């Protein structure tokens, strides 16, 4: 599952969390046997305004 | 980790079971051996370590306190619930590097449900003449907590421009105190005859109004 | 074990402050230094912690640009420095111990960080008459900064019935109390009622009679 | 809710940080998010939407603009403030049904205090035929807007009986331009013969008279 | 999303006002319109809010009596009425679209009412004469009705030092504005100076000569 979120909110994107992405936009089960990959994409996905 | 707490506050009689709840995001459990603590910090008074671990007691621990739970679930357990034992608990977590501590309990004994004593005062001459005045609504030994003070200038409700303060519980009366200011411009003080205050607290069957009038 | 810290820093925003917690009763060499913070009335958000040993000092996500840590084995004390201060960062820091596999396990004491543009103010006090049982009355303390003010009733003769509300900050960036007693209707006559109010970092003692 | 826009009228030079505060009398916090807003209006144009929440810029708003704060102590910052920045700034709600606009801000471009430029008209011949008089004070190219501006009409003050209006700072000059208009009937005007304005400016040690005789 | 209004509505104490805005570039069904008063030069007050689809109304408390709001999706459009118009409802209206979680998101021109019992009046203007390095002189115009008044000077050939302050509105309900040039001394005995001024609502254009 791959998507774009901000920096904040990684702290979210875990097992049993709440907040406006997690419990709203991707919500990850309480198991969960994976993996979360998270790096700063400010050079690619932001752009001038 | 993020930790969720039971009740913020808990109200129990001397003697009584106090439970605190604590829940963790992750599980705290590692190596075998549980790593979810639990502090107890007295107002005026550095943290202080009651629980390390899931249940071994902390050194000079009376065995009033046991820790209890494991997993994502954990609970603090004083069932000789002590006048002394009036503090805020925290349960953390020293699993992970960033150590994380829950959102505090405070306990607070029981006792009856007391009618506030309601009283107001006008602002002093003295601080007129400064160009400010501050009306005060006072709440003298009245429990719970739970107190709604209103501001009425003129029967107008009034917002934002009112502060209040509480008192921690007396040692002997056990009861709360609570002083709400309402602070103005004395030229908008003087556009105004009819002040009041509104007190609705759970001792009472309805709220009870104090109001004066200026001079 | 024994923990000692400074005494209530104050600082207008934007300054550094370079902050002591000297340790006793072990050999702090063998034992990590941890700092946390705590604002008045809230929680507790942990800091960071250091290694005396070797200088190997790790923070908190929040809080790794503002603030370094440092050691000095050769006087056993740490160091923590805060830089470009906000009012957000008002509160009191604690440096403990490691023990029992806790992080922050054993604490000291625990100093007061105060981030405010106002300067001293003078504390100005005035009386709350009572109304025309038992009555009431008090004294008003507004425009004061810092704290503490001690404030008693006839120099500590009148005690019981005594409540002193803690200070609320206002939007001024000043600080204003009431100090409030009920008295039996019987005095009001005959007993004169003074509130004493003493606040030491602007030397102020002031002694205002309440009156009906 | 009554927003209070605290400096609504502030003067900064090109590259300087710019800082407008408004409060609030109730929280604007709802549903976790803030619904407070920031809008701009440049003279002769309609509002224009600046920072649409608490933080969130709108369409085509430069990164200049930021917006900061909660409850209700909220703040809008222009550090690297440049030309067409001129303009009226307003704060408002959007959590109660009664949507309510602050004072307002007219954020001006600091340049030296200068030195007024004080001159005198006499009432034309032609209007004097007419049976009205006007004799008009001239400031031009002075800074700040703020100065004082009297009649004197033979050693008297006159109040009530004159007219005042001031032009917009100008784009590269940056400083304003001040006109007062003082008007009287023919038989008033003739019966004196000083008449005087006065002056008082940052710009000025003294206050600056001009006075002419009739005729 | 392009907003349109009507322009210029004038009318004397008593009547009734009419305001159209056409709306583009949106469905105009799915955004509620929002209309704002600002008297000039003054701050901005919400009035109340329309549904297009449903004709569902919201007021300011103040403005419930003197307002009425009706919405025209067949023309795509929405029409406030004021009834009983008074000096102080003299101002520019707004009509505005709903979003990002504004009420007033989207702002159109602007629309003006000006409430007055006056009458279409010619403006007169006088030559206001230097006094007997650089100097200043100008033009006065008064009593006309209403703004605006084009002023200018040589036709267009003057331009420096030019400045036309804002007008006033006067006791009587006319209005009051001066233009003022600086040149310098040396030009006062040979170059000509005249002041151009246009009042369109009674078509009035005078050219008139300053001379010391």
């Known amino acids: 599952d791959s998507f774009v979120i901000r920096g904040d909110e990684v702290r979210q994107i875990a097992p049993g969390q709440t907040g406006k992405i997690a419990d709203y936009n991707y919500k990850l089960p309480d198991d969960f046997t994976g993996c979360v990959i998270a790096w700063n994409s400010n050079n690619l996905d932001s752009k001038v305004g | 980790i993020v930790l969720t707490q039971s009740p913020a506050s808990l109200a129990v009689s001397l003697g009584q079971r106090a439970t605190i709840s604590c829940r963790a995001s992750?599980?705290?459990?590692?190596?075998?051996?549980?790593?979810m603590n639990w502090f107890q910090q007295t107002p005026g008074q550095p943290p202080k370590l009651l629980i390390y671990?899931?249940?071994n007691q902390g050194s000079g621990v009376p065995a009033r306190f046991s820790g209890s739970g494991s997993g994502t679930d954990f609970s603090l357990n004083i069932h000789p619930m002590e006048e002394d034992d009036t503090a805020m608990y925290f349960c953390?977590?020293?699993?992970?590097?960033?150590?994380?501590f829950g959102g505090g309990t405070k306990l607070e004994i029981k006792r009856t449900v007391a009618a506030p004593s309601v009283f107001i005062f006008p602002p002093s001459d003295e601080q007129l003449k400064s160009g400010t005045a501050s009306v005060v609504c006072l709440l003298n030994n009245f429990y719970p907590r739970e107190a709604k003070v209103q501001w009425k200038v003129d029967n107008a409700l009034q917002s934002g421009n009112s502060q209040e303060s509480v008192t921690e519980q007396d040692s002997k009366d056990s009861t709360y105190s609570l002083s709400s200011t309402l602070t103005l411009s004395k030229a908008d003080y003087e556009k105004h005859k009819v002040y009041a205050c509104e007190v609705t607290h759970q001792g009472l069957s309805s709220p009870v109004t104090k109001s004066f009038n200026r001079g | 074990v024994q923990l000692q810290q400074s005494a209530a820093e104050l600082a207008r925003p934007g300054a550094s402050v370079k902050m002591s917690c000297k340790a006793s009763?072990?050999?702090?060499?063998?034992?990590?230094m941890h700092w946390v913070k705590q604002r008045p009335g809230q929680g507790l958000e942990w800091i960071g912690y250091?290694?005396?040993?070797?200088?190997?000092?790790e923070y908190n996500q929040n809080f790794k640009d503002k603030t370094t840590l440092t050691a000095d084995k050769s006087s056993s004390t740490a160091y923590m420095q805060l830089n470009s201060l906000t009012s957000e960062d008002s509160a009191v820091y604690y440096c403990?111990?490691?023990?029992?596999?806790?992080?922050?396990?054993?604490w000291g004491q625990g100093t007061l960080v105060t981030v405010s543009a106002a300067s001293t103010k003078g504390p100005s006090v005035f009386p709350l008459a009572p109304s025309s049982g038992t009555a009431a009355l008090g004294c008003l303390v507004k425009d004061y900064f810092p704290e503490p003010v001690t404030v008693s009733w006839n120099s500590g003769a009148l005690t019981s019935g005594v409540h002193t509300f803690p200070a609320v900050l206002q939007s001024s960036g000043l600080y204003s109390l009431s100090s409030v007693v009920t008295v039996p209707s019987s005095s009001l006559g005959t007993q004169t009622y003074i509130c004493n109010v003493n606040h030491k970092p602007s030397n102020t003692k002031v002694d205002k009679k309440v009156e009906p | 809710i009554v927003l209070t826009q605290s400096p609504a009228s502030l003067a900064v030079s090109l590259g300087q940080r710019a800082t407008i505060s408004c409060?609030?009398?109730?929280?604007?916090?709802?549903?976790?998010?803030?619904?407070?807003?920031?809008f701009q209006q440049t003279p002769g144009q309609p509002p224009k939407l600046?920072?649409?929440?608490?933080?969130?810029?709108?369409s085509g708003v430069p990164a200049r603009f930021s917006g900061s704060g909660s409850g209700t102590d909220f703040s809008l910052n222009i550090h690297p403030m440049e030309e067409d920045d001129t303009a009226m700034?307003?704060?408002?709600?959007?959590?109660?049904?009664?949507?309510?606009?602050?004072?307002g801000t007219k954020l001006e471009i600091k340049r030296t205090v200068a030195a007024p430029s004080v001159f005198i008209f006499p009432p034309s011949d032609e209007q004097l035929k007419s049976g009205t008089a006007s004799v008009v004070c001239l400031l031009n190219n002075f800074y700040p807007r703020e100065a004082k501006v009297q009649w004197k009409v033979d050693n008297a003050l006159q109040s009530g009986n004159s007219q005042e209006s001031v032009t917009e700072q100008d784009s590269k000059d940056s400083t304003y331009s001040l006109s007062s208009t003082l008007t009287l009937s023919k038989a008033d005007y003739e019966k004196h013969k000083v008449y005087a304005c006065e002056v008082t400016h940052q710009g000025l040690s003294s206050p600056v008279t001009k006075s002419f005789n009739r005729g | 999303v392009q907003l349109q209004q009507s322009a210029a509505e004038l009318a004397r104490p008593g009547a009734s006002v009419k305001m159209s805005c056409?709306?583009?570039?949106?469905?105009?069904?799915?955004?509620?319109?929002?209309?704002v008063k600002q008297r000039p030069g003054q701050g901005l007050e919400w009035?109340?809010?329309?549904?297009?689809?449903?004709?569902?109304?919201?007021?300011?408390q103040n403005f419930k009596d003197k307002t009425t709001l009706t919405a025209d999706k067949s023309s795509s459009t929405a029409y406030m009425q004021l009834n009983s118009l008074t000096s102080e409802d003299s101002a520019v209206?707004?009509?505005?679209?709903?979003?990002?979680?504004?009420?007033?998101?989207?702002?159109?021109?602007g629309t003006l009412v000006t409430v007055s019992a006056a009458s279409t009046k010619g403006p007169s203007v006088f030559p206001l004469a230097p006094s007997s390095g650089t100097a200043a002189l100008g033009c006065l115009v008064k009593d006309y009705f209403p703004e605006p008044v084009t002023v200018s000077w040589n036709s267009g050939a003057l331009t420096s030092g030019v400045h036309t302050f804002p007008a006033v509105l006067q006791s009587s309900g006319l209005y009051s504005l001066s233009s003022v040039v600086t040149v310098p001394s040396s030009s006062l005995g040979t170059q000509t100076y005249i002041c151009n001024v246009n009042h369109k609502p009674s078509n009035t254009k005078v050219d008139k000569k300053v001379e010391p």
């Open positions: 953390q977590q020293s699993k992970e590097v960033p150590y994380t």
């Open positions: 403990a111990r490691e023990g029992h596999r806790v992080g922050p396990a054993y």
């Open positions: 250091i290694n005396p040993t070797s200088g190997y000092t």
């Open positions: 671990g899931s249940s």
């Open positions: 992750e599980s705290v459990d590692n190596y075998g051996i549980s790593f």
């Open positions: 009763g072990y050999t702090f060499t063998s034992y990590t």
